[model samples]
Target chain A: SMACTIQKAEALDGAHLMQILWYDEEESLYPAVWLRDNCPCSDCYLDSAKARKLLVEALDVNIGIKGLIFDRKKVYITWPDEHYSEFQADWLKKRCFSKQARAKLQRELFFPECQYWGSELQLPTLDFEDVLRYDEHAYKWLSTLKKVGIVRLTGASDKPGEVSKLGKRMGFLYLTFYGHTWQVQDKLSFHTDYPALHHPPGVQLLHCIKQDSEIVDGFNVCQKLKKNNPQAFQILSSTFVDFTDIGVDYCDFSVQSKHKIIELDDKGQVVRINFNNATRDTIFDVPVERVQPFYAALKEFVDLMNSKESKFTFKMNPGDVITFDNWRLLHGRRRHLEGAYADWDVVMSRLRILRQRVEN
Target chain B: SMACTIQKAEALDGAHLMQILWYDEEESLYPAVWLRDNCPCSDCYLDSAKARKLLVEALDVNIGIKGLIFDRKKVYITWPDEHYSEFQADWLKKRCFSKQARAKLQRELFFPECQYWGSELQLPTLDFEDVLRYDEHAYKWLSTLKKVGIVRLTGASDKPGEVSKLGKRMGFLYLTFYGHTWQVQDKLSFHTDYPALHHPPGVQLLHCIKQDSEIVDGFNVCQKLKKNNPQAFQILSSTFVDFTDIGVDYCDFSVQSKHKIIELDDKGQVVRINFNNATRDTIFDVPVERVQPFYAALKEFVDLMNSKESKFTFKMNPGDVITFDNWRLLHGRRRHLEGAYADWDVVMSRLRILRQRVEN
Candidate 1:
C-alpha cells in the first residue's frame, strides 16, 4: 500500500512505485534496501478494494541496489527488485552528480496543456445536399442507416399508408409483430432466429407517413423527453407503462421497474426471460408458494420504465425515417386509432446492417 | 331507505343479488340471492364471474330487522340507539314486500357476489367420443374456455409429449417464426401467436419433445402445482415465473402483468416492429406509439401464458402432435425438454382453430 504520486504512470503493463532516497555514510551516499520491497506493480501488490494479498514477506528481495540519484521531490531508485546482487556500485556511480538537468527544466516552463472542453453542440438537421443524393440511391440510404441502428426509406405512396407501399419503402425486409394491439389473427409473438446471429450496439429509425389518433401516441417518447426534459438519456425511454408500448388502455405509470433476469454463459451468450410471478397471469400451473415476491418487483419496474423522465416523444414527416440502434434503444407506440379515429394504418420495414450506408 | 333487499332490486343483464339477515325476530337469517340479470340462455355470461356487475347495493334494512337465523353463527344488529323498532313482529315481512328492499338486496348481492367462490372446478375436457361431433363442440370449447380459462385434451399425441405429432395429432396447422436471441440463440423468445392467442385468455398447448435444463426450474406447472397442493381449480389462479424456466432474461414482469392494452382494429389486425434496440440489427418501422399499451399487455399476457401455471408440458413421441384452440388457449414449452434431450430433434406444428376437423 504505497502512495501513487506520479502523474505519468504509463506502463507497457504494470503498476507504479515510489522513488527511493539514499544517504551514504563514509563514502557519501550508497543505497537503501527498503525501496525494492515497496514496488506498486500488481506483481508486488494487487490493486485496492480486493482481499487477495499475494505477495509475501520481504526476504531475498535484493536487486544489488542498481543505481540511485537525488532530486528535489525525492531520489530516483533504479533497481530490478530481483535477487541477483550484481553490478551494485557501477549502477550507483552512473547517477552521481547529474549534469544535464538544467536544459530540460526550461522547456517545461514555456507551454501549458491544450484545454479541451467540448464546444456546445448545435441541433442537427438534414440539409439540401443531404436530401438529393438519395435519388434512387441505395448506398446513401444504407449509409444513413449505418449511422444509427436502422433506417426506413419511404417511396411515393400509391395511396398513403397502404400496406403495399410499406414493402416498397422498406425495399427488401422482414417484419414481425411484437405487442398485442398490433396483432393480426395469426401473426407473431417473440421467437429467436433459427441460426441466431448476434449484433452490436447502433441506431434504428422508423419513418412515419399517415397520421391519425394512433400515431399521436407514437410520438410520446419524443414529447416527454423534449417537453418535461426528464433527466434521462434516451430521446425517450419508457413513455408507456410497459416495455413494448403495446397495450389497450393508456399506461398507468404508477409502478416500479422490473429488471428482467439475464444471464451470460461461458460463450458470452445472453438470455432474458421474464415470466415473473408478480406480473404473470394466474393460469395454467403457477406454484402457490412464489407468487407474492414476483408480483411486488414486477409492478415496481413497470412504473419506473414509464416515468416522464424515461420517455421521449417525436413526430416524423412523410418520407422521414428516423434511425437508432436496437441494442441501445427501445421503441414503443403511445396509443393507436381506437373507437372512431381514422388514418391508423402504418407499414414499416427492417434492413440488415450491410444494406445501410452512412456517408462519404 | 326501504330496507333495500334482493326482492326490491331490479335485475339488469347478467347481475345478481345476495343478502345476510340477522336477528329476524331472534337471529339473523342469511339469504343469498343468485340472480341472472341478462340471462342470455347459454352464450356469454354462463359463468357468474364473467357477468357484468351492472350494480351492487345494500338489501332492505327490514331484512335484518330483529335479526334472523344463520347456518352456524348467531347473528344480530344493534341500532345506533341500541333499541329495536320491532322484534319477532310483522315489520320484517313488510320490508320484504317492498320493491325498494329487493333492489337494494340485489345490488348488495351482485358485484363479485359471495356466491362466486373458486371451487374445485372440473374443466370440461374434449372427449375422444366428441372428437368434435357437432358445431356446438366449438361453442362448447369456447364456453369451457370462458368458464375455466384453460382446457386439457388428450389423444392428440400418442404419448402426450410428442411435438412432431402436433399438426397430425391436432389435424390441421400453420407455423411461422419471428425473432431469435443473438445470445444463446435457442429461439430466445416466444412466438408471435402467443400474444395473438394467449392475450385474450385463449387456449394454447405444447407437446413436449425435449426438456433440457428447464427441468431445474419450475418447468412444468402441472407437476409443480401437484406438489404444492395449490387448489386445482379449473384454471390456475396464480402466476409462475417464466424466467427460470424459459430463459426470457430480457423480460420485465412488473410492467408486463399490469399491461392489458391490446385492441383489434376494424380489420382485426395487430402489428409489431422490431427496431432492434437491444440487438441493433433489426427494426420495425410500423407506427408504434398509437397502441403501446396493447402491445405491452399482449406481451405480458403471452409471458404469463407461457408461465408454468398457464401452460401444460408433456412429452410426445414422433408422429404425436398436440394442437389446441389458438384463440382461446395459451401454450408454451415446459421449463425444459424431457423427451428429445438432444438425442434427437423434435418438430412442433400449430393449426388455426377454423382449420380443425369436424367429426359431425
Candidate 2:
C-alpha cells in the first residue's frame, strides 16, 4: 500500500477545530462538528445499506475533540463525550478542506456525458457474443448505450427468444401487451416505443432475426430532438400530447396516456420523449389559442425529423441487435421502394431493459 | 385576431438585406438569406411537418429580393428567379431578426418547474373517488405526484383489487410474478419496489383496503438525496450496486439487475433510487479497495435516512391510498410494536402507474 502515515497533530486556534500533519508533510484541518458527523463506527453507520444511523441533531455541534493520535496509516480522535472516531490519512487528504481540494470535490457530479451522431456517422458496434460472456465487454457495451444512448450489436443468434435471453443479461423483459417479443414491419410508425403508456420502457432492444437484402425497406429513422432543433425541442419539452391506442387490440390490450412529447425530470433535463402520429388523440384539452402554437411547434419538430439532416437511417442485418434509449431516440420505419414481399421472413424480439449493468 | 399589419419595406445598402416598417410602429431588418431560409411557401416549407425542404447549399446565398411589397397584413417578396413568398405580419414579427427580438426568442427554452418537500411537508392530498371520475381532479392529483413526487389519496375503496382498477384508469397493468395484485404486511422490508428490473415502474400506489391502528408498522421513508446528503448522493449516483432475488424464488421468477442505488439521468439529476437489502447481491465484482468507500458513501446516505429529520411517517386508514414516485422514494416497514398477529389486519394493493396523466 502507498504510504499514508500521519506525521503529527495540533489544535487549531478554535477549540472546535484540530489540525493533522501527514507524514508526506501535508497538513489539513478537521472541524469537530464535521469529524463527528462522519464517524464510521457500526453503531453510527450501518454498513448493510451504507446508511448513517447517527442523529446529527442530537449531537453537539461545538463538541471538542478530546484527543488525537496517529497510528500506522490511520488518524484517531476522541470526542469530549468519550466517543471515538477513526479516519484513514488518504481519505482525509482527499477531503482536505484546502481551497483547491474543496473545489475539486465540488466538480465531480455525475452528469452523463453523451455524443450524438447522424446519417454519415461511423456507428459504434459491439459483438453480441462478447457482451454475453465478459464483464468488461458487457460494461463497454452497456456504457455505449449509457453514453451515446445507442449501440448496434452484431453476431447475435437468430433463434426465437434469443433477444429475450440477451435482455435477461441486463434485467427482466418489460412485458407489455406488445408481449415480450414482437415483429417489425411497414405498419410501424415513426415514434418513441410505447408512446401510449404512462411509464414507457427506457431502453429498447430490437434484434433482427432475419433479413432480405433485396427488399431494401425498413430503414430505421432515429432522431435526437435536442441536437437538431433546439427551439422545437424546447416547445416539445413544454407541451403535453394526448396519446392512445384504445382501438388497436393485441392479446386483449389497448394503451392510453397523456404525456409531454418531451418529458423533463425534476432537474429540468429531457428524460423522455413521446411521439406517435397514429396514437395521438385530439387537442381539445389545450386552450384554443395555445393549440395553434403547440401545433406550430410540433410542425417545426416533425419537419426537422423529416429533413435528412436529423435522421440516421441504416439497414439491420440478420443477427444484428440495435439497442437504443427509447426516452431520447425516436424510431420509425421507411416505406419500401419496390413491390410487396412475396416471401419475407423477419422475426424480432423487444426487450426494455433497465439502464444498469447485469451479467455479460 | 390582433392587428399585425406592415406599413413599408425598403432594400438596405447591402444587396442581401431589407428593412421593414410595421403598422404597430415596430421597425426590423431581414436579410435575404434569412428570409429565404425561413420562407413559408408550400415549396419552401412543408406544412405537414413544418419543415424546410429547400436545400441551403443549393440556394444562392447572395440572391437578392427582386421586389418587396407590404399590404394590409402581409409582406410579399419576389426572388431573383421571380419566385414568390408571403409572410403574415405576426409570423414575421415573432421571427424578427432585431437584437432584442432575437434575444427574446433565444431566451425561450424548456425547464420543468417542480417543488420539493421534506418531513414537515403539508403533503398534498386528494380523494381517490374524485380522481377516478373527474379529469380536473385526476389531473391535480397526478400532477401533484408528478411535481412533488408523492401524494396521499384519501377515501379509496377498501375492497380487494380496487387499487388495481384504479391503476387501469391510467393504462394496462404491469404484471409481475408478485401477481397482478398484492398486499403489504409485516413481512415486508424497507425498499423501493422491484429493485431487480431495468425499467422499474414509475408510480407506485398502495391502497389501504383495511388497517389495524394498534399494529404500528410500515412507516414509509423517502429521502430526496438531492436535498439531504449531496456528496453521498453523488457517490450513489456514480457507483453501481449489484441487486438480485436469485436466492429468493418467487413464483418461477428469480429477479436480478445490477444498478446504481441512486441513478442520475443524462442531465445529472436524480432519476431513480433502488435500495433493498433483501435483493442486494455479493459485491465480488467491485474492486476490493473501492468497496470500503462505496460502503462509506452508503453509510453517509443511510444515516440521513435513519435520522428523523429525513423521514415522513404517517399511518394509513381504511380507504386511504398513498401513491408516490417509485423511482424517487424509498418505502419500508417499521418493526411491528408489541407482539405479532393477535388482531392484525392490513391489506393493500400495489399498483405501479406511470408518472404521466391519464383520462380521469
Candidate 3:
C-alpha cells in the first residue's frame, strides 16, 4: 500500500511530460509502460561484467524523444506522438555547476503519406512454376487440378513478372483493388498496371477471390486480333501516337480509376492486348487523328472477344496466384456460385519490388 | 635414451628378486609393459586416479598368471597378447628381492561389410520421389516436367518417399528395360511396379543433375497409352486389381528374360500381355467367369486413352524430381532429342529400396 502525492506536473522540454496527458476516457490508446531492462539509465544494464560509465557515448542516450528544442538553460521537446515535455532551468541548476553559451537544438518528426511507399516487396514462395520436370507424380498432380481449369505453366525457372537477365526469363508482380460485387458486372474499364513501369513487363494476372457469387465465374475477357473496338484498339496497338494518354473507366458507373498500359516486346514483336468492350473513354473531346483508328481497333477486337472462340474461363482456388503477361493479357471473373456459397470473400495482396519495371 | 641391463625379463608377485621380462617392441599385436600409465610393480599400478590404492574392481590378479610353477619355483604368466613370460631360476637368482606381476590389456576391433541381395531398380525424382509440401508448387513443377520432358525445381519441404507416394496415387508404376541404340530398335517392354516382388515396393523417382543438348532436343523415347492397351482401360476405370494385372509387351524382346510375365496384384491377377496385340486374352480356352468382362473393360479404356480424351503431355528439364502413382497412371516420355541436336547425355539416378508394389 502506497500513499499518493499529487502535484501540478510541469511539462519538460517544451512538451507535456505528465502521465495520461492525452488520455481518452473512451478509446483504445495509451496504457501503463512495461518497465524492465529497457530503461534509459545504465543501473540495470551492463556490458561484459561492468556497468556503464558516464561518458559521451553513455550519456548521449537514445530515448523515445522526438521533436526537441533546447536553449542553454533548458530543453523544450515535442514527440512525434502528441506527448510533450518541458525541461526546467532549476533542474539544470541543481545538476550542473557551470552555465555556458550553447546553440539551440531543434528537431521534428513528420509522418509520410504512404507507410510502405518505398520499400522492398515481400515475395511469397513460388517453386512450382516450371514445366520441364514431369513424370508420374507431376502428371497425377496436374490431373487433380484439371478438375477445375487448365493451368498455363512456364519453365521451371520462369518466375512471375518480368526479369531483365540476359536469358530473359518470364517473371511478374501484381496489385489488386477491392470493391463491391455489383461494380464488377456494372463496370467496363480498361485494366492495366499504372504507367507501364514494370521492367521487361509482360501481362498482368488477375484471380478473383471474393464476390457476390451470383453472376461472375471469373472468365477472362479478351479481344481477338481480327475483331476489336477501334478506340480500344488504337490505344492498345502501335498505330496510336500517344499510347500513354488513356484512362480506365468501368462503364456501368461504379469504379473510376486510370490504369497504366505499356507495350511489352518479345524480340521485335510488341505484345499489347486490346479489350474492346471493356474500355470506355471519358466525355471529353479527343483529337480526330487519334479517335478514328482507336475506335476502329477497339471495334475489331471487341468482335473477337464476343466470338465463341475468343473467351477463356479461369476460376482459381482460395490460394491460387496466377501469373499473366500484363502488357498482353486481359483477365476478368464472371458471376457464379450463387445461392448457398453466395459471397466470394477474396483478398489479394500485391508485390512488385523485384520486378524490373518496378525496380528500374 | 637410458639403457638398462636385466639378468632375466621375468617377475612374480612378492618374489625376493625381480627380473625384467618383455619391455617394449615395435610390433603392435603385443602390448608393452612400459607403455602402461604405471609400471609392472604391485605398488606402481592401481585402479585409482592417483595409482596409490587399488580398487575392488581390479581384484582379478590371476588374469595373466596361470599358477606358481612350484616345480621350478617360478610363476608362469601370460601377457594380454598371449606372449608367455619365461622365469628361469638361474636368471632370477641374481637380484632376488621381489618380482611384480605384469600384463597388457587387449581390445577387439570389428570391420564393416558392403553387400546387398535384392532386385535393382532406378527411382526418379518427379516420380513422386520428391516430396513437395505446397500443392501449387508440386503440381506446377511436375506438370512442367511432363510438358517439356525435363525441368528443374527446388524449395521442397523434405517429404519422405514422394516417389512411392506418387506411385500409390497413380495406381501403378511403369518399369522398362532399355539397351544401347544399335542393340535395340526402340524396344519398349512395359511393366508395372506391382505384385510386390519384381522390383522393390514403391515408385521410382530420378534426380537429374546434367542433361546434354541433344536430350533437350528430345531424342529419347517414352511410351504413350496405346489405343488397344488393356492396362490403360484398367487405370481409367480405377480397377486397381485389373490395372495392376494388365501388362503389355513390346516387339523388341530377347529369348530368356524378355518373355517374363509379371502380375500386377498383391497376391493374384497375373495376366500376360502381348506387345503386338496390346490387349487382354480373349481366347476360347479362357474361363467364362472372367473372360468377356475383362476384354470389354480393356477395349473401352484403350479407346479413351487414344481418343484424345484423357491424355496429357509434359516437357521435362534438369533437376526435376517427380513422383507419381504407379497403379493408375501410365507414364512415358516422348522421343528425347532430334533434328540438329546430336545424341543427348541425360544422367538420371534413383533411390529405390523396396518393391514398387505396395510402396511400403
| lDDT of candidates 1 onward, in order | 0.26, 0.55, 0.26
lDDT of 1 by residue, B233-283 (tens): 112222111100111123211101111122222232211111111111011
Chain A (candidate 1) TM-score to true chain A: 0.30
User: TM-score of chain B only, all predictions?
Assistant: 0.26, 0.61, 0.26
Q: Is candidate 1 or candidate 2 better by lDDT?
A: 2
List model 2 lDDT by residue over A1-360, tens digit each. 333566777656555676777767776676666667667777666654444456433456456778877765787888888889887777776666676665454332122556665555556799998887865666677667656667888987765565556655643334333322222222223466656666565665667765621110011222344555666567677766656443323223334456888677554666566776645643223432344355555655655555665556678776787766666676666322110110000000111121222332
> Per-residue lDDT for B1-120 in model 3, tens only?
111222234333432122343222211111122111112235433322212222212222223333223223343454453434443333233222222111110000001111111112
Where model 2 places Cα greater than 4 Å from the true spot, the runs are A1-35, A55-66, A92-111, A171-189, A195-198, A212-234, A240-271, A284-289, A335-360, B1-360
* Best model per TM-score: 2
Task: Give all TM-scores, in the order shown.
Answer: 0.26, 0.50, 0.19
**Residue B62 CA displacement from its true place in model 2, Å:** 27
lDDT, residue A336, candidate 1: 19
Q: Per-residue CA lDDT of candidate 2, range B1-360, in tens?
A: 333566787767554677677767778666665576567787776564433455433456556788888777787888888888887777777666555664454332111335655466666898888887865776677557656667788876666565666655643344432222122222223466666555455555666755711111111222355456666666677766655443212222334456888776554756567876545543213432344455566666655565565556677777777766666666555422110110000000111122222322
Off by over 4 Å in 3: A1-236, A241-268, A274-290, A335-360, B1-360
Better of 2 and 3 by lDDT: 2
**Separate DockQ for every predicted complex:** 0.02, 0.05, 0.00
lDDT by residue for model 1 (A235-334), tens: 1131111111111112111111222222222232322222222121111111212222223332333333345554344454554434433332333443
